[PDB]
Paper text:
Streptavidin is a 66-kDa, homotetrameric biotin-binding protein first isolated from the bacterium Streptomyces avidinii. The streptavidin–biotin complex has an equilibrium dissociation constant of 4 × 10–14 M, one of the strongest non-covalent interactions found in nature. The loop connecting β-strands three and four, which is often called “loop 3–4” (residues 45–52), also makes important contributions to biotin binding. When biotin is absent, this loop appears to be highly flexible and dynamically disordered, but it closes upon ligand binding, further burying biotin in the pocket.
The crystal structure of oxidized M112 in complex with biotin shows that the detailed geometry of the M112 disulfide bond differs from the prediction provided by Disulfide by Design 2.0 arising from a steric clash between the sulfur of Cys-26 and the oxygen of the backbone carbonyl group of Leu-25. The crystal structure reveals how a small but significant rotation along the Cys-26 N-Cα bond between Leu-25 and Cys-26 is able to resolve this clash. However, this change also leads to a conformational change in loop 1–2 (residues 23–27) that shifts the side chains of Leu-25 and Asn-23 away from the biotin binding site. The electron density corresponding to the side chain of Leu-25 is very weak and suggests an increase in disorder or conformational flexibility for the side chain in addition to a shift in its position away from the well-ordered contacts formed in the biotin-bound state of wild-type streptavidin. Additionally, the hydrogen bond between the nearby residue Asn-23 and the biotin ureido oxygen is lengthened to 3.7 Å compared to 3.0 Å in wild-type streptavidin; the disruption of this hydrogen bond has been predicted to be an early step in biotin dissociation from molecular dynamics simulations. Comparing the structures of wild-type streptavidin with the oxidized form of M112 suggests that the rigidity of loop 1–2 and the formation of close contacts between biotin and the loop, especially Leu-25 and Asn-23, make important contributions for binding affinity. Consistent with the structural observations of strain induced by the formation of the disulfide bond in M112 and quite unlike the formation of the disulfide bond in M88, the M112 disulfide bond forms very slowly even in the presence of 1,000-fold molar excess of oxidized glutathione, with pseudo-first order rate constants of 0.14 ± 0.02 h−1 (21 °C) and 0.41 ± 0.06 h−1 (37 °C) (half-lives of 5 and 1.6 h, respectively). The much slower rate of disulfide bond formation in M112 compared to M88 is likely related to the strain induced by disulfide bond formation and the destabilizing conformational change required for loop 1–2 to accommodate the formation of the new disulfide bond.
Residue numbers in the entry:
A (entry chain A), B (entry chain A), C (entry chain A), D (entry chain A): 12 to 134
Amino acid sequence: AAEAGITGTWYNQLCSTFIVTAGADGALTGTYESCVGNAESRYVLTGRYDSAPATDGSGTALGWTVAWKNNYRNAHSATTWSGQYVGGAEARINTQWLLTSGTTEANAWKSTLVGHDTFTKVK
Amino acid sequence: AAEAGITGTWYNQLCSTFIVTAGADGALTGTYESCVGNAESRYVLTGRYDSAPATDGSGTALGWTVAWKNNYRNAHSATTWSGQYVGGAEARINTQWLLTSGTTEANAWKSTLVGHDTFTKVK
Amino acid sequence: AAEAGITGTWYNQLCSTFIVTAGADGALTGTYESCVGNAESRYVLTGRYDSAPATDGSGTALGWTVAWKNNYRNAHSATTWSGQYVGGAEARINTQWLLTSGTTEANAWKSTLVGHDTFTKVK
Amino acid sequence: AAEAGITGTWYNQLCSTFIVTAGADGALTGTYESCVGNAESRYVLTGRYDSAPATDGSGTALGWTVAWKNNYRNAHSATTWSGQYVGGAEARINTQWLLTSGTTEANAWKSTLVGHDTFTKVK
Ligand SMILES: O=C(O)CCCC[C@@H]1SC[C@@H]2NC(=O)N[C@@H]21
Ligand SMILES: O=C(O)CCCC[C@@H]1SC[C@@H]2NC(=O)N[C@@H]21
Ligand SMILES: O=C(O)CCCC[C@@H]1SC[C@@H]2NC(=O)N[C@@H]21
Ligand SMILES: O=C(O)CCCC[C@@H]1SC[C@@H]2NC(=O)N[C@@H]21
């Protein structure tokens, strides 16, 4: 149910696009495009999901990472999204994220932004 | 420098073990073993790192995910670590993490733990 | 504008109630009632807000704390909300929060939940 | 034990100073001085702590807020620290924090930094 539900195109609350394949082994592979920040076009993502989730109505735990380097830009930063997939007619991936920039040691205290993204199958 | 510095075995501040290969393409692949929580033995990890970091003394941004399912246990949860690699004689990976459990919608507000891990090359 | 806008009753996305007075000195004082977790009735809150915010269209930074002890219950925990007030016809307080429980040292790694609350003037 | 243990001067891992009084009613009052960021001299803090903590060896949950406005500077930002006090010969306040800046709606996704501070009675 989770494998067959996660694979595809997802859209966050504004204008970012998350394209993912959920493998039978628990792998997440695809691309991410952010409409905000120091980013242009698609970036590689990889992650993991629970490939045997509970059947009690609980969501499916997952996470993925994007390092913000591609052929066009390098922001010297990486975001991880940690969350859960919720199935049904209004399917959702509800996440919180951590965006860490490469910094000097003196600036390390301010290296990491935190936020949240909600993904849907329709933009 | 970052590719040649990240690959290997890392140990957190207590008793967890992070085994990773940093690929030329920006990939992180390996295994994680936690000495705490609902976990036993090794779990698959995958992630991304900045494969062309700044040369100004800044750290190398990275992140990875573990879904807490293996052949022994399934915690129905996933952790993402977001952080930076700092090179030199006392090499470090400094991270913050988000641990999301699969929950019901009613319990989603309490789905996610936050913390921090510091990894070194010596335990 | 911020002082005259923050004072009053606020409601989160589900069923919690945030009653606050914004003082001229930057103080936040009031009570919080949560409809979830180990909580019953009202709890004291105190916090701070920027009493001279920017006039460029930016929000007003603020934060507050609740320790989850009152005359009825003690959860041995505390939540801090950090966020910004956004004025106008659809006024909002957009927050992220950290909920720390008192733990043993062995369990400290799992002491802290993270989430987000959006408050409006209408439930 | 917690009331008699929290009151006083605390120092973080680098060069910040946290001066606090823990009241019998659960109040935290005092001043904070940061050696980093857009900050100079002392700022008002207020917070809450569990004034009847568990006696089983668990820490004492607490939190506080600083809005980064004083007579010298206004950063248009606020930090909340959420954590626990650990008593004994090497007393500690272990915290995680959220630093929210006032932003435009377009920039709200990057409003909030996350980190951690460990406070001791000796610098
Ligand atoms: O500016 C950077 O360092 C790289 C781009 C970051 C974009 C962030 S990732 C979290 C949030 N969700 C999005 O879709 N975009 C932003
Ligand atoms: O209990 C679970 O849900 C699975 C195990 C979680 C272990 C966590 S991940 C973050 C922290 N760092 C570690 O090395 N272990 C804990
Ligand atoms: O269970 C506890 O430890 C005390 C109650 C916690 C309620 C939390 S605080 C963050 C979130 N927002 C709410 O309104 N309620 C929950
Ligand atoms: O730059 C600002 O917006 C105001 C100063 C922020 C200082 C932060 S608060 C968290 C961390 N701990 C400290 O002692 N200082 C920094």
